[PDB]
Design an enzyme around this catalytic site. Structure first.
Site, PDB file in Angstrom:
ATOM      1  N   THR A 190       0.599  -1.161   0.142  1.00  0.00           N
ATOM      2  CA  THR A 190      -0.051   0.133   0.037  1.00  0.00           C
ATOM      3  C   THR A 190       0.486   1.449  -0.276  1.00  0.00           C
ATOM      4  O   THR A 190       2.029   1.488   0.118  1.00  0.00           O
ATOM      5  CB  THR A 190      -0.889   0.100   1.249  1.00  0.00           C
ATOM      6  OG1 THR A 190      -1.359  -0.649   1.381  1.00  0.00           O
ATOM      7  CG2 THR A 190      -1.923   1.615   1.332  1.00  0.00           C
TER       8      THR A 190
HETATM    9  C1  LIG Z   1      -0.190  -2.501   0.669  1.00  0.00           C
HETATM   10  C2  LIG Z   1      -1.002  -3.087  -0.623  1.00  0.00           C
HETATM   11  C3  LIG Z   1       1.188  -3.537   0.856  1.00  0.00           C
HETATM   12  O1  LIG Z   1       0.967  -4.363   1.108  1.00  0.00           O
HETATM   13  C4  LIG Z   1      -0.907  -1.967   1.730  1.00  0.00           C
HETATM   14  O2  LIG Z   1      -0.188  -2.213   2.869  1.00  0.00           O
HETATM   15  C5  LIG Z   1      -1.948  -3.216   1.728  1.00  0.00           C
HETATM   16  C6  LIG Z   1      -3.047  -2.527   3.225  1.00  0.00           C
HETATM   17  C7  LIG Z   1      -3.931  -2.776   3.104  1.00  0.00           C
HETATM   18  C8  LIG Z   1      -4.852  -3.593   2.186  1.00  0.00           C
HETATM   19  C9  LIG Z   1      -6.230  -4.122   2.050  1.00  0.00           C
HETATM   20  C10 LIG Z   1      -6.926  -3.761   3.753  1.00  0.00           C
HETATM   21  C11 LIG Z   1      -6.476  -2.364   4.128  1.00  0.00           C
HETATM   22  C12 LIG Z   1      -5.082  -2.153   3.944  1.00  0.00           C
HETATM   23  N1  LIG Z   1      -1.529  -4.761   2.756  1.00  0.00           N
HETATM   24  C13 LIG Z   1      -2.236  -5.784   2.224  1.00  0.00           C
HETATM   25  O3  LIG Z   1      -2.192  -5.768   0.764  1.00  0.00           O
HETATM   26  C14 LIG Z   1      -1.428  -6.476   2.740  1.00  0.00           C
HETATM   27  C15 LIG Z   1       0.584  -6.787   2.813  1.00  0.00           C
HETATM   28  C16 LIG Z   1       0.897  -7.543   4.088  1.00  0.00           C
HETATM   29  C17 LIG Z   1       0.305  -9.122   3.329  1.00  0.00           C
HETATM   30  N2  LIG Z   1       0.740 -10.370   4.562  1.00  0.00           N
HETATM   31  C18 LIG Z   1       1.055  -9.486   5.245  1.00  0.00           C
HETATM   32  C19 LIG Z   1       1.777  -9.474   6.675  1.00  0.00           C
HETATM   33  C20 LIG Z   1       1.955  -8.015   7.145  1.00  0.00           C
HETATM   34  C21 LIG Z   1       1.726  -7.187   6.829  1.00  0.00           C
HETATM   35  C22 LIG Z   1       1.375  -6.412   5.413  1.00  0.00           C
HETATM   36  C23 LIG Z   1       1.098  -8.177   4.893  1.00  0.00           C
HETATM   37  N3  LIG Z   1      -1.970  -7.503   2.431  1.00  0.00           N
HETATM   38  C24 LIG Z   1      -3.345  -8.108   3.151  1.00  0.00           C
HETATM   39  O4  LIG Z   1      -3.380  -8.367   4.149  1.00  0.00           O
HETATM   40  C25 LIG Z   1      -3.492 -10.247   2.875  1.00  0.00           C
HETATM   41  C26 LIG Z   1      -3.348 -10.794   3.382  1.00  0.00           C
HETATM   42  N4  LIG Z   1      -5.133 -10.382   2.653  1.00  0.00           N
HETATM   43  C27 LIG Z   1      -5.644  -9.678   2.030  1.00  0.00           C
HETATM   44  O5  LIG Z   1      -5.345 -10.334   0.665  1.00  0.00           O
HETATM   45  C28 LIG Z   1      -7.166  -9.899   1.969  1.00  0.00           C
HETATM   46  N5  LIG Z   1      -8.461  -9.765   1.257  1.00  0.00           N
HETATM   47  C29 LIG Z   1      -8.124 -10.494   0.038  1.00  0.00           C
HETATM   48  C30 LIG Z   1      -8.788 -10.886  -0.870  1.00  0.00           C
HETATM   49  O6  LIG Z   1     -10.142 -10.227  -0.380  1.00  0.00           O
HETATM   50  C31 LIG Z   1     -11.344 -10.190   0.181  1.00  0.00           C
HETATM   51  C32 LIG Z   1      -9.110  -9.765   1.263  1.00  0.00           C
END
Ligand SMILES: *[C@@](C)(CO)[C@](*)(O)[C@H](Cc1ccccc1)NC(=O)[C@H](Cc1c[nH]c2ccccc12)NC(=O)[C@@H](C)NC(=O)CN1CCOCC1
Ligand SMILES: [Mg+2]
Ligand SMILES: [Mg+2]
Ligand SMILES: [Mg+2]
Ligand SMILES: [Mg+2]
Lengths: 195, 226, 222, 211, 196, 233, 204, 195, 196
Positions: D1
């Site tokens: 993000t």
């Molecule tokens: C950037 C894209 C960096 O990756 C953002 O910070 C983003 C923040 C965000 C995204 C969605 C809602 C709110 C905030 N972060 C993520 O997307 C995050 C990155 C990530 C993955 N594993 C991590 C571990 C520790 C810190 C960050 C991490 N990804 C996720 O949270 C993934 C696991 N979640 C999803 O993909 C959830 N969605 C998938 C599609 O269906 C709906 C839920």
């Protein structure tokens, strides 16, 4: 956080503290005040792990302010420093210790003397004419050892402090974005707005 | 992978599936695991796909030169010995697990060989991730004095067991029959029990659907005259 | 050392129409390179015109579904047989998942149904509870194979109108249930070809104002 | 993000991207990284999506209860602190949440940065996420207090674009918000694909890229 | 694996099971662990199959070359070649070998070569994972100068128990008899030895 | 968290037209040592259910006692304990599955793989699997450990799908199970010749066969096999 | 850390009716950072086309190496190398570094000048050949490409139809991969004419 | 070392490189020139592990100077960059690789064009209008993406470069002690002494 | 350690060596591994001495309390108490116990409780590090309904071999005879059993 300095002169205590706050590879803020007023004539600067520093400082502040209201009386800098040390010595053997180093600068109204206490996260307390935490002392103590007298004026203390910051700015790899300086004397606590 | 080898009356037969994987993904749906060392010596390989090919081609090359040097037809024991000594030297780092079979002036032969250099003799063998599914079939139905037609059936039945029950195995069945006094017959896609059904829809696009920025002719020809 | 998690494979797919919604999933259950079952249902009718599927670690998926079904039951008891809306179910599931923030349900969860205006709705979850409403979502083993296909054939991504050359997009015309089921079947047929954990069978649950209907289709068993 | 937010003459701007990742795989093209806590409070999100959603929706519960008890809207300073205190209870437990609390209250517009460590910083400008360095470059060189609402909205929009382009884990779409004393105002969802080409032509920037 | 070699009046007998495992899977249930390095010098193999096969192949090469130059080698000489390989390459090998042979001068001799590469000449020897379970039985029942039929029964009963208790051992019992008369191969199936 | 000590190997089972069959060998292994040769790993619950267990034997004996106590507890204040309100295979299975999943969630699992085979009140066949992780699945054929790799392929040649169940007789199904047990004896290093077999039929009830042996084994071809490649003698 | 996913990138190749197509993205990165949007991964040696994904230093290195080897082949053989022969040369060259490999995923595409038969092939980093009739994929979005190719592809497509199919397979796979994109190129190849088209795609 | 930037404008290439050198916690030097002239119209800046940087740079310099004397001819920037890339690609699979990242700025006298090549320690070469190594690009590329034109003058290039350094000085935690700037054009190489 | 318990016509006999090691040092060469939990219920201990002593002390407490309330406990009951401790505390224990006792109704019974906490009722049982070497001997030589003198010879010969091959085993052979007649302790010294 990074650098916190302290020097006790004739009639006051001077605390200098860096302004930088860094998250990851980015400097988020360059005007951060790493200090809390515990009482009208007692100031505490702090440095350590993210979050723990402010939480601990504010927790100490609340306790001293509570004492002041209850007794309608200001605790001596010595008494406050001992309270802080005990809280840190209690903390080091906890499940998750508070990783905070502090300098406590105060003016004792009873004895009419400035006082500087250096306390690390283990609860290691020492009263000093000048002090620092982390790597700050490695650069600055040689200057302070040379130039420090106990009869120095506040203005001379500030000039010696400028020399310490200049040395830090020359030989430290990290950019700490200058310092906020505060003076503690008989009239209370005030900030030097131009430094 | 699922590979098998079965001996019979007047020769030997080997078979294999046709799936190749990249973890859980299928890279090739019609892979060729039956390799030729010499005209009448064929091997089937499981494990690291590049190693099974490379080691097979190397020994096959040296076997051809040996056959020319000696004015004799190559023996299976020669390929076996050359393979195991090569694999042993690399201490299992060449991940080649093979079933080697063939006919030569000595007779019909069937060996298995592991990546570390250990060899094994048998009337029926199986290797690969589907070796247990296949061996269950072989242990159930194998008998002494099999005919050619019975052995091909047993072999392809053993491979099918792997195809259906093992996720690392699938698609089609390849076979190679090596009978004494005959040319070896390589039956590529002997069975085809996994044809994809017709799709419900055509995904052919209207021409002009994709956005383009630049077009240019590519000069593949050499420098021209005049 | 004991590993409390496992991977039972499978893949699931949810698509929202204008006045309907589908939730599909293959019926294959696996461990490593073995097949446990060729028909082990993965998509469930949870009541109140809601369908649900927890893909990943079967034990955690069965537990979550079992808990949500229970949550629906107690919602009726506590709130005078009120119908649980799809948006309220989604929020409830977030809290079920975050219950185990520090020992997660290793599942990718999807639910489908109709919103309070009668339009088709699909909600997608991650293992720790982040959710969001979507139009299209594939989850599980072959999710990365299918999603790009759906971006192309459902939302008409990278598709433009001929003659304009990239200036005008393909307009977002809605899809019928018959058109959607074709995309679902082609998605799983394609996924079965290139993914070893996908196959055996395909079970689709279609949700309309009339109720929940099932459709079953065979897949390759290799 | 990539998220950003900054105070200025006419309130505070808040802009975020829309991408979500699962390693190299882009799991979501269109995710909402802002939460409308109340008509005068916003919350950005960066880090674990689950943590960001749960704790900021729990913050909204606690901010609503404040209004009912005190008959008065909560301040931005107090709201940010409630959130930072939640983080300190799960201190060291492995949460991943970086957020800005944007809003307008009695002291005027307010902006606080809060992270999983319990950090709480007041400031005029912040940017969080994997692509925050790219956003800061555009912001620092173009920011003024004397900005017009039209120019300010563009700045935050353009700053996210800068990050979406260079950062692999940022992109999809841009969501804009403008916070006034009458409340916040949503200024739309802007696809980066379309926005990039538009900005390239109109601004003349991204000369290196062919279009 | 369960292997043994026993000397008796007329010569020596080698014996072994036929099971080869890859963990708990039986890769081969009809293995031949009795291998010939010379006409009347054989060995029993235990440990890494790759290592023991590679060694026995090299030894067979050395004794073939010895024979071409110096005539029939002794059983002691064969054991020395095994030892020299096992000892000098001990860091990269996992091989436990029993060597057994017949001369007319020295008659039946048995040498065991455990992991380190040491050599031990013995009246009889046992080795392999299944040998642990029959140290007591073999010590109590072994006699010197047994008859052929007594020695076959001794090996049959001994390996029968090793197979019974060791999962890594099983299948058929193979034996090789080394006397002046020649070389006799024997085989005993489960239905025979299990009921002992 | 623990490690299994004394273990039991494969349990295999399948459905046929009128019921289910289940089988398991009588061995208790101690690593590579075949320590205990008289261990029963099929445990009947009433006259309509048989639970087959593999894995840790101490945990098996624990489960055996839970089931024995379950029967006792069901009879309490239950006049229809031997009739309408008797224990069903589905009740017994779900109980175990609840226990297995709870234990794994406390990171202190019962190191087992269980197959519950039986016939329900309405004559329907019941056959479902559960393991130390709490993972459950059902199929016309089920097997644990090595049986999953070797037996299932053979049993699925008889009942490849649901529609093949009514076409499968008890004689054919038993024959298939017995052949599978022979194959496991050939190829599983932690198996034994002696085994137990149970049939639960909707007409003839529960038939529990003990002290069965693997017979008609092929070994004769071993005499011809010599060396590991080049050896002739 | 994983060398095959530091720089990112993808390549896909397809067969048609008397034609082949090969396409690649243009991105080069240092993990999350995008460095170049002009890093073409497709090279040609006469009428044989080679696409290479993986570690960029090895991509560049291998191109220079196969240019070296094909130029010598031509001087000695007095003719241009064919796709079937070149495929074996790639396999040979990769396996000679079996225990210190190039971290790449090559893809060969071309038409035999004599038989006129379309040809494509893929390899792993160690030389194993995957000679497919339909399509070959390689890169960080290989899983995505497999799903797109497997569903959109149909045999015996005409050049101008094949263009649309391969372009959409690449574009939509790249839009679900963080490490691929930033432009794309498609080569349409016929027996004696080759067209190269740059695609318009989202730049994030 | 830390930060090295590069920008190619209309008629020249401009390379900016930090002046700091740090051993342990102390900054030993604040005037270090992280560059070597390979030929009259080719300049190479470098950054990486201590020692390796200079050794590699000087080794490249010696090879190009040897070529110049042998042929009485200056190699093109493209040719030099390819030579450097090969040396690094050769190095990465060595027993102990040279951990050096470089920017090669040159003016091609034949084509009358400035050229900038970015090469990392793996041997990853790319021709660019502007480039950077390490974390430098994270802060600066957004500014360059916005402000860069190919028809910029040298003076405009320097102003855009000042803006990049100012951003680095604001948001980087490390104090890199400013930069030495050098310009490469048709007339050769010269240093901007006031920056 | 080498321990065993054997049933016979008139009751049951427990047997054990007397060696306790701390690595290769013999901390005690005259250990008593045969321990009494009730008048005619004894156990043989193997594994951690601390653990097996702590357990046997607790069991002795439970059976003393059982007897006060419900009269003389069965050997099966004693084995259940051992099991309940060994099974529920398996993560923190290393105890291999053989339980043996005599009733007038049930006569001689033997229960073995290996590491996991499982229980196995047997005609005879062997355990300890030295037991591995006599699985074959004991299986071949054990008969049901032996006489007292035959059973003593069986245990004496068996442990003799275990001691011979196992370094962790040695010293004297202690035995405890459990019959209707009472409780008889026996002891056999090296000079007696070594020459067998
Ligand atoms: C950037 C894209 C960096 O990756 C953002 O910070 C983003 C923040 C965000 C995204 C969605 C809602 C709110 C905030 N972060 C993520 O997307 C995050 C990155 C990530 C993955 N594993 C991590 C571990 C520790 C810190 C960050 C991490 N990804 C996720 O949270 C993934 C696991 N979640 C999803 O993909 C959830 N969605 C998938 C599609 O269906 C709906 C839920
Ligand atoms: Mg201190
Ligand atoms: Mg399969
Ligand atoms: Mg991006
Ligand atoms: Mg001893």
């Amino acid at each position: 956080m990074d650098i916190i300095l302290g020097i006790r002169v004739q009639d006051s205590v001077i605390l200098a503290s860096s302004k930088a706050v860094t998250r990851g590879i980015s400097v988020l803020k360059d005007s951060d005040d790493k200090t809390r007023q515990l009482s009208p004539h007692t100031l505490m600067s702090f440095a350590g792990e993210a979050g723990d520093t402010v939480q601990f400082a504010e927790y100490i502040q609340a306790n001293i302010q509570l004492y002041s209201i209850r007794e309608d009386y200001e605790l001596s800098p010595q008494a406050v420093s001992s309270f802080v040390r005990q809280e840190l010595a209690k903390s080091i053997r906890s499940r998750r210790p508070y990783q905070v180093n502090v300098l406590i600068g105060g003016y004792d109204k009873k004895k009419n003397k400035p006082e500087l206490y250096q306390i690390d996260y283990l609860g290691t307390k020492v009263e000093l004419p000048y002090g620092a935490h982390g790597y700050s002392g490695f650069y600055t103590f040689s200057l302070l050892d040379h130039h420090y007298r106990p009869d120095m004026t506040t203005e001379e203390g500030l000039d010696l402090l400028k020399l310490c910051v200049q040395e830090l700015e020359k030989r430290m790899p990290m950019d700490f974005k200058g310092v906020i300086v505060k003076i503690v004397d008989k009239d209370g606590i005030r900030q030097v707005d131009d430094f | 992978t699922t590979i098998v080898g079965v001996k019979f009356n007047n020769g030997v037969v080997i078979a294999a599936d046709t799936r190749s994987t990249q973890g859980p993904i299928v890279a090739d749906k019609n892979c060729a695991k039956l390799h030729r060392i010499s005209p009448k010596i064929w091997c089937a390989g499981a494990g690291t796909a590049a190693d099974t090919e490379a080691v097979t081609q190397l020994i096959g090359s040296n076997i051809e030169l040996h056959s020319l040097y000696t004015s004799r037809e190559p023996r299976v024991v020669s390929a076996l010995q050359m393979l195991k000594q090569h694999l042993f030297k690399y201490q299992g780092h060449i991940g080649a697990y093979l079933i080697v079979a063939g006919v030569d002036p000595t007779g019909s032969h069937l060996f298995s060989i592991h990546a570390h250099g250990s060899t094994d003799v048998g009337y029926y063998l199986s290797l690969g991730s589907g070796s247990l599914a296949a061996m269950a079939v072989l242990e159930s139905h194998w008998k002494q004095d099999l005919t050619k037609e019975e052995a091909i059936k047993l072999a392809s039945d053993a491979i099918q067991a792997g195809i259906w029950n093992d996720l690392g195995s699938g698609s089609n069945v390849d076979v190679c029959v090596m009978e004494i006094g005959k040319d070896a017959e390589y039956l590529r896609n002997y069975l085809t029990p996994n044809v994809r059904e017709e799709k419900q829809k055509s995904y052919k696009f209207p021409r002009g659907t994709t956005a383009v920025l630049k077009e240019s002719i590519v000069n593949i020809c050499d420098i021209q005259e005049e | 050392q004991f590993n409390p998690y496992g991977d039972n494979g499978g893949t699931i797919l949810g698509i929202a129409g204008e006045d309907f919604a589908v939730l599909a999933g293959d019926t294959r259950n696996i461990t490593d390179y073995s097949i446990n079952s060729r028909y082990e249902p993965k998509v469930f009718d949870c009541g109140d015109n809601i369908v649900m599927s927890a893909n990943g670690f079967a034990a955690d998926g069965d537990a979550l579904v079992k808990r949500f079904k229970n949550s629906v039951k107690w919602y009726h008891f506590d709130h005078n047989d009120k119908k649980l809306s799809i948006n309220s179910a989604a929020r409830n599931i977030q809290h079920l998942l975050y219950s185990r923030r520090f020992f997660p349900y290793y599942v990718y969860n999807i639910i489908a149904g109709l919103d309070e205006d009668g339009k088709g709705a699909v909600y997608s979850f991650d293992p720790v509870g982040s959710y969001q409403r979507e139009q299209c979502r594939a989850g599980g083993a072959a999710a990365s194979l299918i999603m790009p296909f759906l971006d192309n054939q459902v939302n008409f991504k990278n598709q433009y109108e001929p003659g304009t050359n990239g200036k005008v997009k393909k307009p977002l015309k809605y899809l019928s249930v018959e058109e959607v089921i074709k995309l679902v079947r082609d998605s799983f047929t394609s996924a079965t070809e290139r993914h070893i954990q996908v196959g055996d069978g395909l079970e689709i649950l279609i949700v309309t104002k009339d109720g929940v209907r099932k459709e079953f289709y065979e897949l390759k068993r290799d | 993000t990539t998220t950003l937010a900054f105070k200025f003459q006419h309130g505070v701007i808040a802009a975020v991207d829309s991408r979500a990742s699962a390693g190299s795989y882009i799991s979501a093209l269109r995710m909402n990284k802002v939460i409308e806590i109340n008509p005068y409070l916003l919350g950005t999100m960066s880090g674990c999506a689950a943590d960001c959603q749960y704790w900021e929706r729990l913050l909204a519960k606690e901010c609503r209860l404040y209004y009912l008890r005190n008959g008065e809207r909560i301040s931005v300073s107090a709201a940010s602190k409630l959130l930072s205190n939640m983080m300190c209870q799960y201190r060291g437990m492995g949460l991943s949440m970086g957020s800005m609390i944007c809003g307008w209250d009695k002291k005027g517009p307010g902006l606080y940065y809060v992270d999983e460590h319990g950090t709480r910083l007041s400031g005029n400008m912040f940017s969080t996420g994997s692509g925050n360095t790219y956003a800061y470059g555009v912001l620092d060189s173009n920011y003024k207090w004397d900005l017009s609402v039209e120019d300010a909205l563009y700045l935050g929009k353009r700053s996210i674009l800068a990050a979406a382009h260079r950062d692999a884990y940022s992109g999809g779409s841009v969501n804009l918000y403008h916070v006034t004393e009458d409340g916040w105002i949503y200024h739309g969802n802007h696809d980066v694909g379309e926005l990039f080409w538009k900005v390239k032509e109109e601004e003349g920037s991204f000369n290196n890229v062919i279009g | 694996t369960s292997i043994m070699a026993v000397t008796f009046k007329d010569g020596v007998i080698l014996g072994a099971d036929s099971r080869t495992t890859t963990g708990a899977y039986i890769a081969n249930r009809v293995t031949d662990k009795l291998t010939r390095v010379h006409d009347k010098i054989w060995c029993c193999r235990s440990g890494s199959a790759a290592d023991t096969q590679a060694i026995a192949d090299i030894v067979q090469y050395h004794l073939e070359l010895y024979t071409s130059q110096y005539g029939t080698p002794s059983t002691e000489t064969a054991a020395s070649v095994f030892k020299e390989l096992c000892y000098e390459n001990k860091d990269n090998l996992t091989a436990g070998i029993i060597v057994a042979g017949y001369d007319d001068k020295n008659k039946g001799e048995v040498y065991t070569i455990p992991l380190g590469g040491s050599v031990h000449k013995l009246p009889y020897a046992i080795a392999g994972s299944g040998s642990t379970f029959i140290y007591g039985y073999c010590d109590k029942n072994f006699r010197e100068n047994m008859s052929k039929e007594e020695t076959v029964d001794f090996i049959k009963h001994s390996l029968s128990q090793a197979i019974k208790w060791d999962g890594s051992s099983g299948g058929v019992i193979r034996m090789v008899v080394l006397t002046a008369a020649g070389v006799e191969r024997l085989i005993f199936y489960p239905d025979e030895y299990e009921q002992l | 968290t623990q490690q299994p000590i004394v273990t039991g190997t494969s349990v295999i089972s399948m459905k046929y037209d009128n019921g289910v069959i289940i089988a398991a060998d009588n061995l208790g292994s101690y690593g590579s040592l075949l320590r205990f040769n008289g261990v029963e790993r099929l445990i009947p619950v009433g006259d309509n259910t048989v639970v087959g267990i593999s894995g840790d034997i101490s945990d098996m004996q624990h489960i055996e006692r839970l089931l024995k106590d379950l029967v006792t507890e069901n009879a309490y204040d239950n006049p229809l304990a031997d009739a309408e309100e008797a224990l069903e295979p589905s009740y017994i299975f779900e109980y175990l599955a609840t226990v297995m999943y709870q234990r794994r969630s406390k990171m202190n699992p019962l190191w087992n793989a269980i197959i519950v085979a039986g016939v329900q009140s309405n004559g329907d066949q019941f056959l479902r699997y559960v393991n130390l992780l709490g993972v459950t699945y059902s199929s016309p054929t089920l097997a644990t450990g090595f049986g999953a790799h070797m037996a299932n392929p053979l049993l699925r040649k008889v009942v490849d799908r649901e529609s093949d169940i009514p076409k499968t007789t008890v004689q054919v199904a038993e024959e298939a199970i017995v052949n599978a047990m022979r194959v496991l004896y050939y190829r599983d290093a932690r198996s034994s010749r002696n085994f137990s077999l149970a049939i639960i039929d909707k007409n003839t009830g529960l038939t529990f066969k003990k002290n069965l042996q693997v017979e008609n084994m092929k070994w004769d071809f071993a005499k011809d096999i010599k060396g590991y490649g080049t050896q002739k003698i | 850390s994983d060398p095959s996913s530091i720089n990112g990138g993808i390549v896909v190749a397809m067969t048609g009716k008397d034609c082949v197509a090969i396409a690649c993205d243009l991105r080069l990165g240092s993990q999350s950072l995008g460095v170049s949007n002009k890093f073409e991964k497709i090279f040609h040696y006469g009428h044989v086309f080679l696409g290479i994904t993986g570690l960029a230093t090895d991509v560049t290195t291998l191109n220079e190496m196969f240019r070296y080897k094909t130029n010598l082949y031509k001087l000695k053989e007095e003719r241009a190398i064919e796709p079937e022969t070149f495929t074996q040369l790639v396999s040979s060259s990769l396996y000679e570094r079996r225990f210190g490999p190039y971290f790449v995923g090559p893809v060969v595409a071309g038409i035999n000048s004599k038989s006129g038969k379309p040809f494509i092939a893929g390899f792993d980093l160690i030389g194993c050949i995957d000679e497919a009739k339909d399509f070959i994929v390689s890169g960080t979005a290989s899983d995505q490409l497999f799903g797109m190719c497997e569903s959109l592809y149909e045999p015996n497509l005409e050049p101008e139809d094949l263009f649309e199919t391969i372009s959409q397979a690449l574009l939509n796979a790249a839009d679900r991969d963080a490490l691929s994109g930033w432009g794309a190129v498609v080569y349409i190849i016929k027996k004696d004419e080759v067209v190269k088209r740059y695609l318009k795609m989202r730049q994030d």
